[PDB]
Design a binder for this molecule. Structure first.
Ligand SMILES: Nc1nc2c(ncn2[C@@H]2O[C@H](COP(=O)(O)OP(=O)(O)CP(=O)(O)O)[C@@H](O)[C@H]2O)c(=O)[nH]1
Ligand code: NA
Ligand code: NA
Ligand code: NA
Length: 413
């Protein structure tokens, strides 16, 4: 029997609307992440999450030898496959109005799959925008998956293949592989598993770093395999980006609970202890980077699920983490509005304007109070928890009623 371990790597799945991201995750994991019959009142808005084990049948033909279940009967072997690792997928919504959600999920990714529909002109707006965001944030362990190849001839697929290679030529993604599949009919998925093992290696983890977990609200993610057992108290979900946490460790939620004392709005950190640690349906004594973890606490559930709880990160109780209402950012602007149907030119940052800041897994609006050539200073509508000095931020500006990614930078403390 394969061992029960936590997922050790997060693979993002991004791409233009309806290109088949959720169906590809289902092809790999067997899990349909988005309740898709109807949603709220015309797309999925939450992140999708699913996990799978990955194995390989030793004396069997590749790529068919790679498996996602402990069986080798498909290749004539009577042995169990060799367990390789457990992986997880962060499924981001494709709609252009939901870019903040993609950026929030991109903070959790160790690698990424860019889904490109073979029956659509390349590149579509969010194909370009999700690709640029990946390079901006540093998720450069990328596989480009040519989905829906069942719809088109081998000629048309190869034609689009050459377009993608020319698009990536001269960029950081020049050597990125392109793997054609049919997610819906599960064709050539084995070559994608092989590509994942070859191009999305599990990253080195510095397990001595100060433990930091980026929180994902329960209402912002669909994780069918994970469940909130809250007999001991509220459960907080998210992903560990550095260090490790253990059961019985004293922790704090930052910035914390909104409090208005005499008309003064502040955020009080919430302290608790880790009652339990869960990945999917299994309990663990420790939690490392990789996978969506469920941190069981002793807090009352009405607190952990409250909208007034600005729970952006979790750290150890005695960790030093500034919570800033004002931040300075060494920024860089793009050359063009990438996610629009027509690529506008981006105007420079001007004082007194409102910008959207993606920091870790949170999004915050703020007022520019100082503009320089390579630095800005922002008055934040809500504080952000800054656990390090080299923290990436993505800058967005509202254009035509839609927030569009215009630049990036580093939060300087
Ligand atoms: N013919 C064919 N259709 C596919 C394939 N993969 C997905 N589709 C179809 O495309 C449609 C959208 O697929 P879905 O996986 O939901 O796309 P999505 O990208 O997750 C939608 P969103 O961008 O809102 O997240 C569905 O009808 C699905 O059946 C494929 O490999 N071949
Ligand atoms: Na599986
Ligand atoms: Na990362
Ligand atoms: Na084809």
């Amino acid at each position: 029997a394969w061992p029960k371990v936590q997922p050790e790597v997060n693979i993002g799945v991004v791409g233009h609307v309806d290109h088949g991201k959720t169906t590809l995750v289902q092809a790999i994991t067997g899990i349909w992440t988005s309740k898709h019959s109807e949603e709220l009142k015309g797309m999925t808005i939450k992140l999708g999450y699913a996990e799978t084990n990955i194995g390989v049948c030793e004396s069997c033909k590749k790529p068919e030898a790679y498996v996602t279940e402990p069986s080798c009967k498909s290749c004539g072997s009577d042995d169990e496959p060799k367990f390789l690792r457990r992986i997880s997928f962060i499924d981001a919504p494709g709609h252009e109005v939901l870019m903040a959600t993609m950026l929030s999920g991109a903070a959790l990714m160790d690698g990424a799959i860019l889904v490109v529909a073979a029956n659509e002109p390349f590149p579509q707006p969010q194909t370009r925008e999700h690709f640029v965001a990946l390079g901006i944030i540093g998720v450069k362990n990328l596989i480009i998956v040519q989905n829906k190849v069942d719809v088109v001839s081998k000629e048309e697929a190869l034609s689009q293949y050459r377009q993608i290679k020319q698009f990536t030529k001269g960029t950081w993604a020049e050597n990125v592989p392109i793997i054609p599949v049919s997610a819906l009919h599960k064709i050539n998925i084995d070559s994608l598993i092989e590509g994942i093992e070859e191009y999305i290696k599990t990253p080195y983890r510095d397990l001595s770093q100060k433990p930091v977990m980026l929180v994902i609200r329960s209402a912002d993610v669909n994780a069918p395999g994970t469940q909130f057992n809250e007999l001991k108290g509220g459960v907080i979900g998210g992903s560990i980006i550095q260090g490790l946490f253990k059961v019985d460790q004293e922790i704090k939620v930052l910035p914390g609970l909104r409090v208005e004392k005499q008309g003064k709005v502040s955020y009080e950190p919430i302290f608790t202890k880790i009652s339990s640690i869960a990945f999917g349906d299994e309990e663990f004594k420790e939690a490392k980077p990789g996978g969506l973890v469920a941190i069981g606490t002793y807090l009352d559930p009405s607190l952990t699920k409250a909208d007034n709880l600005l729970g952006s990160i979790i750290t150890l109780a005695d960790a030093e983490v500034p919570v800033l209402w004002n931040i300075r950012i060494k920024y860089n602007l793009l050359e063009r509005v990438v996610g629009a149907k027509e690529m506008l030119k981006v105007d420079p940052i001007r004082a007194k304007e409102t910008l959207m800041l993606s920091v870790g897994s949170s999004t915050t609006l703020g007022i520019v109070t100082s503009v320089k050539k390579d630095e800005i200073e922002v008055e934040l509508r809500r504080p952000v928890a800054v656990w390090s000095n080299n923290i990436r931020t993505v800058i967005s500006r509202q254009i035509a009623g839609r927030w569009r990614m215009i630049g990036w930078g580093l939060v300087e403390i």
